[PDB]
């Protein structure tokens, strides 16, 4: 389930995903697709478990070696998006590293932060329980 | 509360309840207006002849 013009290899998966999400929020788009990325699978799954995300499905073409992943940016049936905005802390040119001592709340603690610490992605709040720090990738709410 | 139509160049979500119906067509506005009118005319104990009745019109705009 690709939208149109299958997405090629961007400079980084997170930037392309951010463009897709902002365009979905702006131009009345609901389901968006991105290039295959394990971190994308993990972040989509954790956003689903967080409750802000709708169905997400991995996709394959005539072949199975290449892959992509589509997902419905969670919209209620009254034209409201669950995700209202995003921000990236870590950047491709500057992967900011913040240890366990550097995990504050999210702008009041209301938002959700994500860190790529040791294996997969962990929320900064739950990362603070396991005294785990790492490079924080994005702030969302 | 406001009830509006949406025809060719606008969002269907600019009002409370959604009605994408149209009246520019000659044969449309007749039954559209009759069915809208007889959907409220029953409240005032007044004639209601287009709500579930087979009554219908096929007429050009005039």
């Amino acid at each position: 389930i690709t939208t149109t013009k299958p997405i090629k290899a961007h400079f980084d998966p997170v930037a392309d995903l951010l463009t897709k999400i902002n365009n979905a929020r702006k131009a009345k788009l609901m389901t968006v697709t991105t290039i295959a990325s394990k971190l994308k699978i993990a972040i989509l799954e954790i956003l689903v478990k967080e409750g802000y995300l709708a169905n997400f499905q991995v996709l394959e073409n005539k072949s199975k070696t290449k892959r992509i992943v589509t997902f419905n940016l969670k919209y209620t049936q009254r034209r409201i998006p669950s995700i209202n905005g995003v921000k990236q802390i870590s950047k491709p040119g500057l992967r900011i590293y913040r240890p366990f001592e550097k995990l504050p709340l999210v702008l009041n603690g209301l938002g959700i932060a994500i860190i790529s610490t040791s294996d997969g992605v962990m929320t900064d709040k739950v990362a603070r329980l396991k005294k785990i720090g790492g490079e924080i990738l994005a702030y969302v709410w | 509360p406001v009830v509006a139509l949406c025809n060719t160049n606008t969002n269907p979500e600019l009002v409370d309840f959604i009605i994408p119906a149209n009246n520019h067509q000659p044969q449309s506005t007749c039954l559209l207006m009759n069915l809208l009118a007889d959907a409220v005319a029953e409240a005032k104990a007044m004639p209601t002849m287009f709500a579930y009745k087979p009554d219908e019109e096929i007429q050009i705009e005039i």
Binding site: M30, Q57, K74, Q77 | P12
Partner: peptide, 23 residues
Amino acid sequence: RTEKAQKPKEELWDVVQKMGNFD
């Protein structure tokens, strides 16, 4: 095509519906 269908939740009636019975 889809091979793994997780999180059953879809968005088809994305047109607004609001303002119930009003006096």
